[PDB]
């Protein structure tokens, strides 16, 4: 199936306390494999998955250098953005960055992305074709000109199209037991009477990887959108995920409703009935 | 593998 490599960076200013919190984590699809925490004692990019441990010193010294370069850039950016918006030194603010590349079943480059947000809102983003920025505000317009002057998009694009995919290919090989597995959902249904006249049907999917899944409720072969509640897909803690969808139904009508499960390790979707 | 391409906004 398709795969991705994504890095995520979070920078949180703490007025009156000194340096902002900086956290970085790196993912291959839904498996984290590296991390850095401004508050941990090592000040090194740390491994989080067995297969990245094979990389030797130059890889680690490099990623630590790079992650620190991100840390420092964010640290300045918090100050710069406060000025861009004439905000005071009083409140805590957040910068977030996310970039990465996607590849198809052939492991060939599909797409790249690089976006940046301040205070939880889109600030600036590389366009789909990796050649220009989308900057909605005036502040982002200012940034856009600076990044143009320093050939940021040209150099990012080279990274995202080459280095990003080459190392994803490498990771997928080095951790093929971990990363290339497809664990199919284990499914079941529970039932709890709400009132005299209603009952909850809950559709359960457990221990699946990857996290991408679809759970849909169905009355009489038609797609339910009314009374239907879907929780956030949630990590079990062992590299698998869980999700449920519930639907409130009139008592004695249960057999009108089907749950439909779609996932990569199911050749056909599952139709569950109560 | 992270990028080196980051610049002050």
């Amino acid at each position, epitope marked *: 199936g398709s795969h991705s490599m994504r890095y995520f960076f979070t920078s949180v200013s703490r007025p009156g306390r000194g340096e902002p919190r900086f956290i970085a984590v790196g993912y291959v699809d839904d498996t984290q494999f590296v991390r850095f925490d401004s508050d941990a004692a090592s000040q090194r990019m740390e491994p989080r998955a067995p297969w990245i441990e094979q990389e030797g010193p130059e890889y680690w010294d490099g990623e630590t250098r790079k992650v620190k370069a991100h840390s420092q850039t964010h640290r*300045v950016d918090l*100050g710069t953005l406060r000025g861009y918006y004439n905000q005071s030194e009083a409140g805590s603010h957040t910068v977030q960055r996310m970039y990465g590349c996607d590849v198809g079943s052939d492991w060939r480059f599909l797409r790249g992305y690089h976006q940046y947000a301040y205070d939880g809102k889109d600030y600036i983003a590389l366009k789909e074709d990796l050649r220009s920025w989308t900057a909605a505000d005036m502040a982002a317009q200012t940034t856009k000109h600076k990044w143009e002057a320093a050939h940021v998009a040209e*150099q990012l694009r080279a990274y995202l199209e080459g280095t990003c995919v080459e190392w994803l290919r490498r990771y997928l090989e080095n951790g093929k037991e971990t990363l290339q597995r497809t664990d199919a959902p284990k499914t079941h249904m529970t039932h709890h009477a709400v009132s005299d006249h209603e009952a909850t049907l809950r559709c359960w999917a457990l221990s699946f990887y990857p996290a991408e899944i679809t759970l849909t409720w169905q009355r009489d072969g038609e797609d339910q959108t009314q009374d239907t509640e879907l929780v956030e897909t949630r990590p079990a803690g062992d590299g698998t995920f869980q999700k449920w969808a519930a639907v409130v139904v009139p008592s004695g009508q249960e057999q009108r409703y089907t749950c439909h499960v779609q996932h990569e390790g199911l050749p056909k979707p599952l139709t569950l009935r109560w | 593998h992270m990028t*080196e391409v980051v610049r002050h906004c």
Partner: T-cell receptor
Framework: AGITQSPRHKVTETGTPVTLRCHQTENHRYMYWYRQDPGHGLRLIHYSYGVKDTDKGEVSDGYSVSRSKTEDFLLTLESATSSQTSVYFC?????????????FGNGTRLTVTE | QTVTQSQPEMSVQEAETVTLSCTYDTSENNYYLFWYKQPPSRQMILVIRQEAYKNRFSVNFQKAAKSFSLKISDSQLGDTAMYFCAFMGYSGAGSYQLTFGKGTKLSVIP
């Protein structure tokens, strides 16, 4: 370019405090204080990435800086030492790249007499 | 990150050509290099600029070799100066600043 350092020449008694003032008209974000000494080139004392944002260069110690406003970067020596007899250079940059280089002021000859 | 000017002093006969050496160290793909001329006025005058990504004074930019020599042909007496090589990072060590070499005092001889 439009830097002016104040003062251009100074003599100061060992243990006195003295301040050097670098002033720009350009409204540029990045300012620097370097000192030039025989056998060391120019070495960075402190820098500032923006208002009230300063950090240490490689020859930090003995020197403080302040970035109250954008236009001024002040170099301060709490207690003058003879080792701080040097030529002091301020620098300004808009983006710090090849096409937006550091522009230097004309320097300040300071000697710390006993 | 560091810059190396291995020759503190050099001489040239007037109208002849001279080459000042400069090497640098960096772990980064992108960066910028500079030559500054400092005449007896003490001003720092930018003479050459170079971006790593991509007239009597010329540079031989050898990126693989990390070498950035400055050639002055047809030396005038006005070229008597101290010449500085400077390094500027992109994102990595020494980004947003210049790191200088130790300088070469060039004396042009009539």
């Amino acid at each position: 370019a439009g830097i002016t350092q104040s003062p251009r020449h100074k003599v100061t008694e060992t243990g006195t405090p003295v301040t050097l003032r670098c002033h720009q008209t350009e409204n540029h974000r990045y300012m620097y204080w370097y000192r030039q000494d025989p056998g060391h080139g120019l070495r960075l004392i402190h820098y500032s990435y923006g208002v009230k944002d300063t950090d240490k260069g490689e020859v930090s110690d003995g020197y403080s800086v302040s970035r109250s406003k954008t236009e001024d970067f002040l170099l301060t020596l709490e207690s003058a030492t003879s080792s701080q007899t040097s030529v002091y250079f301020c620098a300004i940059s808009e983006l710090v790249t090849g096409d937006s280089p550091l522009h230097f002021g004309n320097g300040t000859r300071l000697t710390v007499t006993e | 990150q560091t810059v190396t000017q291995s020759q503190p002093e050099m001489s040239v006969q007037e109208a002849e050509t001279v080459t000042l050496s400069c090497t640098y160290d960096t772990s980064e793909n992108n960066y910028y290099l500079f030559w500054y001329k400092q005449p007896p006025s003490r001003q720092m005058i930018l003479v050459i600029r170079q971006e790593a990504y991509k007239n009597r004074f010329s540079v031989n930019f050898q990126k693989a070799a990390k070498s950035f020599s400055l050639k002055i042909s047809d030396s005038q007496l006005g070229d008597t100066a101290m010449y500085f090589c400077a390094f500027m990072g992109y994102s990595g060590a020494g980004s947003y600043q210049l790191t200088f070499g130790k300088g070469t005092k060039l004396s042009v001889i009539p």
